[PDB]
Amino acid sequence: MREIVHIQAGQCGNQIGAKFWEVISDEHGIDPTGSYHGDSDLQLERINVYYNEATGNKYVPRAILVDLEPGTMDSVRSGPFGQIFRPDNFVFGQSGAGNNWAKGHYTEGAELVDSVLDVVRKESESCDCLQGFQLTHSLGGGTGSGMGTLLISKIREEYPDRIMNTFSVMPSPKVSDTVVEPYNATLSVHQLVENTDETYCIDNEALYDICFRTLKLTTPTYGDLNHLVSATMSGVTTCLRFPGQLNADLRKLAVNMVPFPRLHFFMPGFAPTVPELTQQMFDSKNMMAACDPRHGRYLTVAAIFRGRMSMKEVDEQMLNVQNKNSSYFVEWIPNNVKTAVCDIPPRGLKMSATFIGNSTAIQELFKRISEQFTAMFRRKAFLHWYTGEGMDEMEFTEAESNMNDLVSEYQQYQDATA
Amino acid sequence: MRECISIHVGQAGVQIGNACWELYCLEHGIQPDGQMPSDKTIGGGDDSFNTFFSETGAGKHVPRAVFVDLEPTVIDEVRTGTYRQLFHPEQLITGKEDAANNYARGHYTIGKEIIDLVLDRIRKLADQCTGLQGFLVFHSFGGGTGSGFTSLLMERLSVDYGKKSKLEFSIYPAPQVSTAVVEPYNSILTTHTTLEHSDCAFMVDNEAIYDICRRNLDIERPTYTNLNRLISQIVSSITASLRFDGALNVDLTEFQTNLVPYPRIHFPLATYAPVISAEKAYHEQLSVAEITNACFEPANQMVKCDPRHGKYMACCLLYRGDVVPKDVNAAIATIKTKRSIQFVDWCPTGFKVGINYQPPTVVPGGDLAKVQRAVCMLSNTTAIAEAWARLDHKFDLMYAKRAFVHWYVGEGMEEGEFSEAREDMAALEKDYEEVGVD
Amino acid sequence: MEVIELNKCTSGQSFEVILKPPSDPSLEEIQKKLEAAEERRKYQEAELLKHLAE
Amino acid sequence: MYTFVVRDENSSVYAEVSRLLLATGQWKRLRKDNPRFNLMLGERNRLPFGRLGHEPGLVQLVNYYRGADKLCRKASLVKLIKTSPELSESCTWFPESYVIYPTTDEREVFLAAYNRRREGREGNVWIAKSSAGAKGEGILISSEASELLDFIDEQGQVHVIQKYLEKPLLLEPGHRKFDIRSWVLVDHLYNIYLYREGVLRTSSEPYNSANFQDKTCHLTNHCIQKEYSKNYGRYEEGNEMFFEEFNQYLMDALNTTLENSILLQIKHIIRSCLMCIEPAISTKHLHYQSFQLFGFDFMVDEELKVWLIEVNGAPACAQKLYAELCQGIVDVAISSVFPLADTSIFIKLHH
Ligand SMILES: Nc1nc2c(ncn2[C@@H]2O[C@H](COP(=O)(O)OP(=O)(O)OP(=O)(O)O)[C@@H](O)[C@H]2O)c(=O)[nH]1
Ligand SMILES: CNCCCOc1cc(F)c(-c2c(Cl)nc3ncnn3c2N[C@@H](C)C(F)(F)F)c(F)c1
Ligand SMILES: Nc1ncnc2c1ncn2[C@@H]1O[C@H](COP(=O)(O)OP(=O)(O)CP(=O)(O)O)[C@@H](O)[C@H]1O
Ligand SMILES: Nc1nc2c(ncn2[C@@H]2O[C@H](COP(=O)(O)OP(=O)(O)O)[C@@H](O)[C@H]2O)c(=O)[nH]1
Ligand SMILES: [Ca+2]
Numbered sequence A: 001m002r003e004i005v006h007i008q009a010g011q012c013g014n015q016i017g018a019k020f021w022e023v024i025s026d027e028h029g030i031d032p033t034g035s036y037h038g039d040s041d042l043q044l045e046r047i048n049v050y051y052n053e054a055t056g057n058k059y060v061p062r063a064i065l066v067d068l069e070p071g072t073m074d075s076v077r078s079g080p081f082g083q084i085f086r087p088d089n090f091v092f093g094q095s096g097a098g099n100n101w102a103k104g105h106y107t108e109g110a111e112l113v114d115s116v117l118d119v120v121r122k123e124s125e126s127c128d129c130l131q132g133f134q135l136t137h138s139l140g141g142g143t144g145s146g147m148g149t150l151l152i153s154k155i156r157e158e159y160p161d162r163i164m165n166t167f168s169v170m171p172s173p174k175v176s177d178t179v180v181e182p183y184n185a186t187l188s189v190h191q192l193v194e195n196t197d198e199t200y201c202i203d204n205e206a207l208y209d210i211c212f213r214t215l216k217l218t219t220p221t222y223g224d225l226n227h228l229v230s231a232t233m234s235g236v237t238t239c240l241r242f243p244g245q246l247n248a249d250l251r252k253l254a255v256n257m258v259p260f261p262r263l264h265f266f267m268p269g270f271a272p273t274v275p276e277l278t279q280q281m282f283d284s285k286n287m288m289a290a291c292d293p294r295h296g297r298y299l300t301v302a303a304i305f306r307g308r309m310s311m312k313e314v315d316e317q318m319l320n321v322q323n324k325n326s327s328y329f330v331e332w333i334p335n336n337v338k339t340a341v342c343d344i345p346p347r348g349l350k351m352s353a354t355f356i357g358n359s360t361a362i363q364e365l366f367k368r369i370s371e372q373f374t375a376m377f378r379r380k381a382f383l384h385w386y387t388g389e390g391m392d393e394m395e396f397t398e399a400e401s402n403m404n405d406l407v408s409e410y411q412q413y414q415d416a417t418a
Numbered sequence B: 001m002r003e004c005i006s007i008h009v010g011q012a013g014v015q016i017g018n019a020c021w022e023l024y025c026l027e028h029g030i031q032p033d034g035q036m037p038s039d040k041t042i043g044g045g046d047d048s049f050n051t052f053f054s055e056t057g058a059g060k061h062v063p064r065a066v067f068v069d070l071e072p073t074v075i076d077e078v079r080t081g082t083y084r085q086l087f088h089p090e091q092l093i094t095g096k097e098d099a100a101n102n103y104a105r106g107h108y109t110i111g112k113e114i115i116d117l118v119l120d121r122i123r124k125l126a127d128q129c130t131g132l133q134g135f136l137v138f139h140s141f142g143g144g145t146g147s148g149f150t151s152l153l154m155e156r157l158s159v160d161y162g163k164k165s166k167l168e169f170s171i172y173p174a175p176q177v178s179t180a181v182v183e184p185y186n187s188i189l190t191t192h193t194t195l196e197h198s199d200c201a202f203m204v205d206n207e208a209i210y211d212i213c214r215r216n217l218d219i220e221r222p223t224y225t226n227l228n229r230l231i232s233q234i235v236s237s238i239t240a241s242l243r244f245d246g247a248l249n250v251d252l253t254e255f256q257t258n259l260v261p262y263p264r265i266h267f268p269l270a271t272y273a274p275v276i277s278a279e280k281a282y283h284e285q286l287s288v289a290e291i292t293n294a295c296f297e298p299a300n301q302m303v304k305c306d307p308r309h310g311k312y313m314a315c316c317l318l319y320r321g322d323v324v325p326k327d328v329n330a331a332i333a334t335i336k337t338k339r340s341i342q343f344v345d346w347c348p349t350g351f352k353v354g355i356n357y358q359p360p361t362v363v364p365g366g367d368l369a370k371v372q373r374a375v376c377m378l379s380n381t382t383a384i385a386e387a388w389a390r391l392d393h394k395f396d397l398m399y400a401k402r403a404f405v406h407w408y409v410g411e412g413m414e415e416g417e418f419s420e421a422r423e424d425m426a427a428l429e430k431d432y433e434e435v436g437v438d
Numbered sequence C: 001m002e003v004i005e006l007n008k009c010t011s012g013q014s015f016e017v018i019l020k021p022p023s024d025p026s027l028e029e030i031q032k033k034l035e036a037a038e039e040r041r042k043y044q045e046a047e048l049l050k051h052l053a054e
Numbered sequence D: 001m002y003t004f005v006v007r008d009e010n011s012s013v014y015a016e017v018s019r020l021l022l023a024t025g026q027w028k029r030l031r032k033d034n035p036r037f038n039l040m041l042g043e044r045n046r047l048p049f050g051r052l053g054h055e056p057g058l059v060q061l062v063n064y065y066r067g068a069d070k071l072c073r074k075a076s077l078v079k080l081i082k083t084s085p086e087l088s089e090s091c092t093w094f095p096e097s098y099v100i101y102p103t104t105d106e107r108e109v110f111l112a113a114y115n116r117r118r119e120g121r122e123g124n125v126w127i128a129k130s131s132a133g134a135k136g137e138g139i140l141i142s143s144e145a146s147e148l149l150d151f152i153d154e155q156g157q158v159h160v161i162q163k164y165l166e167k168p169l170l171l172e173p174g175h176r177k178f179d180i181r182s183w184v185l186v187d188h189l190y191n192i193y194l195y196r197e198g199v200l201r202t203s204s205e206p207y208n209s210a211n212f213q214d215k216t217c218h219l220t221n222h223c224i225q226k227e228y229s230k231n232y233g234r235y236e237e238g239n240e241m242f243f244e245e246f247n248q249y250l251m252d253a254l255n256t257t258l259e260n261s262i263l264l265q266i267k268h269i270i271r272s273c274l275m276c277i278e279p280a281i282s283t284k285h286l287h288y289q290s291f292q293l294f295g296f297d298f299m300v301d302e303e304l305k306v307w308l309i310e311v312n313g314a315p316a317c318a319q320k321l322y323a324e325l326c327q328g329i330v331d332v333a334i335s336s337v338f339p340l341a342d343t344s345i346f347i348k349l350h351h
């Protein structure tokens, strides 16, 4: 009754999105046919936040799957839960984007966008009171990057008073499978800076090191990387999906986490005793973005504990980490660490701890991308492929300046005193 | 007999109101279905408990209360709870999206859309009143609705009911159970806007309530139900004089004349004792002089402050149960010899005392133990300004950087209202100093 | 220590114990501030939809 | 480990306690307004006491007692003594004093006693003082009340008039004046610890009762002896005589000891002063706890009677003694609340 509309764009967005629905469907006891087969009834008290309810008590995800090529859309339909989605919500083209942000944003994605907004509008109109949107996508490709931010912009025009959240896979510091990723990511960041309320930054190199070093998967795959993300997306959305009152809707969470409108890029974390969890959740090696928190200060933090646990012990150890490392929390935002607890644990574990941090250390990620981008743009390398789709150079100059401005802002607040 | 209407605004206001009204029903013998066997005037009456309860021809007793929130999850519990039949749906008002811990959103954006239906539903209650005393307004400082919408309604109530009195029961923000980081903002803004419309406000810092429940009830992690049940006791002991025969505080006007010589300084400190755990099969009972002496220990106050470093302007002692005046004055004289109790030069050093022979009523299954004498003291001491100093300092640290201000400007409020509200608290902190300091 | 103004009834008693003697906006104004707040919001939405139209 | 904050950088005593706590390896210093501290070494004026004890999960301690100002300033101390039954306007160890305001004011009562003793031709030399005067200035000594009542209206801050001790004990050689300084530590349990080591702060010129003009012969402040007379430093280093030397002088020159002749009265005055305020400043039931180090200033007359002249709430130690005292502060007042990892220098005054 405070509904959210989920959108997934491009290959990465759709594969991450697909398994996010696997995780939470199991948590709410929904089976691939859409029928509920659970034990408790807190699985359904807030089910309508992510599921439309239908005929004969079958719950359909309020999800819209978007890509410019049908391939990855076919695997989703072939997957374990491929059958649970409303078939009218598969909006796909045939041309693809060629790893080109311009194609996704301006030419190929332009032809397909109105069809997506048609589906979005139909979903939103069946919402007692729409809350906001969440998008999953990568920033290094063409569709989720170029078209994904086009959808965001069109969505904000029809729904300017609604919250726009994203889970955004960013370029990684050392690994890359495409040459023009800096152009795609920088252009998309400029969009997110302006048109999202909360973005969770994920990169595959950090996702991978957890899989290999921690979970000891000797040969990790995108499938393993995506299960980590999906488990984290379940964690960060626990308070939206189960009865609580800390960060219960998208707006309240944004009011508590975003002190300044542009600094809305978050570092997620996940773990795995009560003193054990709270130590891990704060460790560098549990962040899904490749930024070290001890290189900056937290402006705000949102910790979420799941399972049966002494809330007394949790409260006590949360305070011990804050007071133990007081130097890493801005002194001009009092009580900026909020903790929530949910009794529903994730499957496989019994006590989870998901971490959402708004640290100025995130500037390191925007500086990596900015250094890569300038190295190419100073020589205009590969630029003709973008101006050939109709773009102007200043559109790159503006994108570079804005992310560089974003970096100075993070540092301006990284040094502020009381 | 003059009637009082209670208005519960926001989540805290609603959930506290529902504990109070449950507690009123037990004290008066009213059952969940509104039937009061003890009431012999069927379908009417001029009794003192009628100040809070209406009556229908069918013999039901209906609280003179209105519950309002900007989202329906909380008020729905009232529509579904033990005491659902008590209220007619007209008294329960729901928006659909709340104020998102944003004062400006609850006061300006959403408040304007709903303020007027709320006033109609209030007027529906006032129309049933032969002479209406005024309003008791339960709300929180930190919520978006509790701070934003409450201040809007107070402004309107000062117009639709210009002469009637308004009392607040405010929940002051405490980080150990707080929901939002911007609660200092919402607290300063609603206090500034409400100050000149409240005749007397009883603040309850959730920190104090939280630590009492931990110390004296052995609750390792107090919940809202634990806090509200303790709160409703202190509330009930304050409103008892309006619901029972007596000659002290029988009128919302008396609360101000007895406790507030200065309009702006209308925040009396409440101290309550004894709070004893019901898990103790028995607790060797306490004296009048001991519970009375406990009224001057900061660990029993609703707001942690040091009255020793301020001055009193008024003090009221509200006893419940086996108490007689001679034992009270014995406790007072002996207590004045061992305590630091300095009144202002321009006021008499004295205590107004009220006694109600009915011992405190407890909720079955609660953590509070049935006692045979309890006392609540209401003292207007300048030491309560410590709570303003704490809030103002937190407000200052965040506002120096304009942290979170964009959320309020985005709702149509001007940055100036921040400075304006803070300057008002700066004046109030200083007026408290001219009074209670040399 | 005087004990003045003692009153008694079946439900209890009251009295006072001296120890030592001594030594708003118009309704129209309200609306005009809520309308100026609604206008500021509408101006902000307008400048956003203008820039999105660009 | 524990955390503390420094809010009076101008504190010799708490500067070195801060240095001591960091040498601990168990204490970390944050900066002024980081509120997540265990210990506050706070400022001297308008210390925000209302913001302490409200940080969840943190036992917080502060090195000042709220309300001790009523004892640690002149106008305050006079009214406290005269209006507190435990201390009695008839108090014997406090020189007859009167609060007087320039331009609740005992100017009419002071002249009553003034003429009462010129009627008896007794000594009528009085002194006026206040807590605006520093660097040894603001104070005047005379025998004509008119000279001191005109001099106080020449000011604008409230001063106190007090009978000058015309017959003080004079050290020989020298025939010089002196005052004694006792440092006392009050922990969070309100235990009153007296430092075993005091100091006699000296005058280096013979005591001339004939003229009070030269206030190097009368005002024993370390200020005016270092800076306006050249025999500062002759008899003892820095005009500071310590107890073991003063004890030998008393035995050798008067057949008595420091303990019997002076120290018993000192301990009695300390107890009386701090126990009269315990109800109003104690923090044993408070959401934060307090300690504080005080400096008591005493004068000794020729009959070996001790008199209190003032109490200092923000005192400085003597350079030879900073190490010993400042660590006693740590073990008794700080590590008492915050234990570390694992004889005495104080005299505990019972009560
Ligand atoms: N004692 C007590 N405090 C409460 C209760 N509910 C909320 N609070 C406190 O009130 C503050 C949160 O404000 P709420 O009243 O929940 O918010 P609201 O009035 O519903 O306004 P919005 O939800 O923002 O629209 C926090 O400081 C909580 O600690 C309650 O039932 N009892
Ligand atoms: C010590 N720090 C080392 C961190 C190693 O970081 C990573 C991240 C990944 F996301 C992958 C990965 C995975 Cl897991 N599955 C895949 N399926 C198809 N491609 N692909 C992947 N990457 C493509 C580019 C490649 F194989 F060409 F390299 C990977 F191998 C290493
Ligand atoms: N009633 C009195 N009789 C005799 N001598 C007196 C006196 N009052 C003060 N004095 C002397 O005058 C000196 C200055 O007085 P006082 O102690 O109050 O100044 P002060 O406040 O600067 C000391 P500190 O620097 O330690 O705070 C004292 O050292 C004392 O020797
Ligand atoms: N975690 C994850 N990342 C992916 C996956 N597929 C592609 N990516 C990432 O996204 C980039 C390729 O973008 P892609 O989604 O294929 O482009 P698009 O389909 O046009 O939006 C590379 O940087 C990959 O690291 C996936 O299945 N899981
Ligand atoms: Ca085409």
Ligand SMILES: [Ca+2]
Binding pocket: A114
């Ligand atoms: Ca169309």
Ligand SMILES: [Ca+2]
Binding pocket: B039, B040, B041, B042, B043, B044, B045, B046, B047, B055
């Ligand atoms: Ca009746």
Ligand SMILES: [Ca+2]
Binding pocket: B158, B162, B163, B197
């Ligand atoms: Ca009025």
Ligand SMILES: [Mg+2]
Binding pocket: B010, B011, B071, B098, B099, B143, B145
């Ligand atoms: Mg609410």
Ligand SMILES: [Mg+2]
Binding pocket: D131, D310
């Ligand atoms: Mg002095």
